[PDB]
């Protein structure tokens, strides 16, 4: 049943790369059910079941599969395989919120990569590890700042390495997450610098999602830099791409952000305009949360210029929610 296993796994690989993990999983599970005498093939199968379930957002199953892969990788003495499973287990543990163990695992990926003189693996491990420390500081105080600073150092180290490797997409990932870590630590200038680099690279790849993200993140930093007009301008950009990308949830998000910025700029006509557009998009998406916050936002703006009744209208409207 080895060839049949090989064959079934090929279907699964195709389907997952094809963008549909649901069917691929079933074919991998079929391959497992058929079995094989080649443990490196099973390893590969386990690893791909783990990544698919991870991407399918079943983390418990992703954890089990990567754990089996890790164990088997050791059993057969496959070092690169062990490093990989270890990194995958690490990332999964991070999502589940075991940070201590996630660190241990991602460190393993890093340490083995170095023994193997594998620079690609090493850099990737540094980024994953940075992500763990970032999540640790975010989820939570001295330990918080310490974790966030660890993430910065780790991103800086990754960037140094992927610069040598000429890996632009890796730079893009690390710049964005570095920027957001600076942002949490309260270094806004540094956050801006990082996201600016992330934006250049998103434009370079033609990636509109990443481009929108950078714009959003830059807008946020300029808010805390006390420069409101500049933030509103970056939000203006996110609005455009949101329409461009045909993402309504993001479009609404853009509108809300612009609403609050113009509130700080103390221009309440534009504020109302965008809060109105948010209100509309929110209902459209059947979002009760945003709806109320939109009603609340509108109540305030109308109150700011002393519009009387119309403020009360959204008041009640918000009260209901």
């Amino acid at each position: 049943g080895s060839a049949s296993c090989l064959e079934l796994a090929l279907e699964g690989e195709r389907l997952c790369k094809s963008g549909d993990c649901r069917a691929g999983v079933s074919f991998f599970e079929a391959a497992v059910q058929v079995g094989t005498e080649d443990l490196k093939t099973l390893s590969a199968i386990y690893s791909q079941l783990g990544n698919a379930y991870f991407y399918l957002h079943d983390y418990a199953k992703a954890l089990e599969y990567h754990h089996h892969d890790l164990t088997l990788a050791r059993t057969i003495g496959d070092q690169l395989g062990e490093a990989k499973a270890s990194g995958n287990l690490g990332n999964t543990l991070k999502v589940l919120g075991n940070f201590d163990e996630a660190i241990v695992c991602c460190q393993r990926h890093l340490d083995i990569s170095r023994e193997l003189n594998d620079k690609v693996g090493e850099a990737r491990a540094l980024y994953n590890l940075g992500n763990v420390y970032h999540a640790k500081g975010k989820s939570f105080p001295e330990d918080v700042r310490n974790a966030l600073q660890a993430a910065v150092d780790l991103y800086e180290e990754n960037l140094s390495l992927v610069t040598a490797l000429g890996d632009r997409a890796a730079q893009g990932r690390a710049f964005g997450n570095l920027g957001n870590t600076h942002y949490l630590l309260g270094n806004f200038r540094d956050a801006v610098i990082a996201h600016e680099q992330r934006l250049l690279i998103a434009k370079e790849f033609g990636d509109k999602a990443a481009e929108r993200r950078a714009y959003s993140n830059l807008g946020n930093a300029y808010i805390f830099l006390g420069e409101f007009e500049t933030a509103s301008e970056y939000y203006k950009k996110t609005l455009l791409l949101a329409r461009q990308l045909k993402d309504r949830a993001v479009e609404a998000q853009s509108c809300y952000s612009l609403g609050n910025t113009y509130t700080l700029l103390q221009d309440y006509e534009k504020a109302i305009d965008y809060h109105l557009k948010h209100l509309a998009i929110a209902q459209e998406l059947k979002d009760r949360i945003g709806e109320g916050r939109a009603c609340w936002s509108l109540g305030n703006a109308y109150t700011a210029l002393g519009n009387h009744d119309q403020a009360m209208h959204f008041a009640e409207k918000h009260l209901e929610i």
Binding site: S47, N51, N128, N180, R213, N217, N220
Partner: peptide, 17 residues
């Protein structure tokens, strides 16, 4: 809302070109 970059995962295949 902080917009994060995604994780990477390590991948294996049953075939090596």
């Amino acid at each position: 809302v902080m917009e994060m970059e995604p994780e990477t995962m390590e991948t294996k295949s049953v075939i090596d070109s």
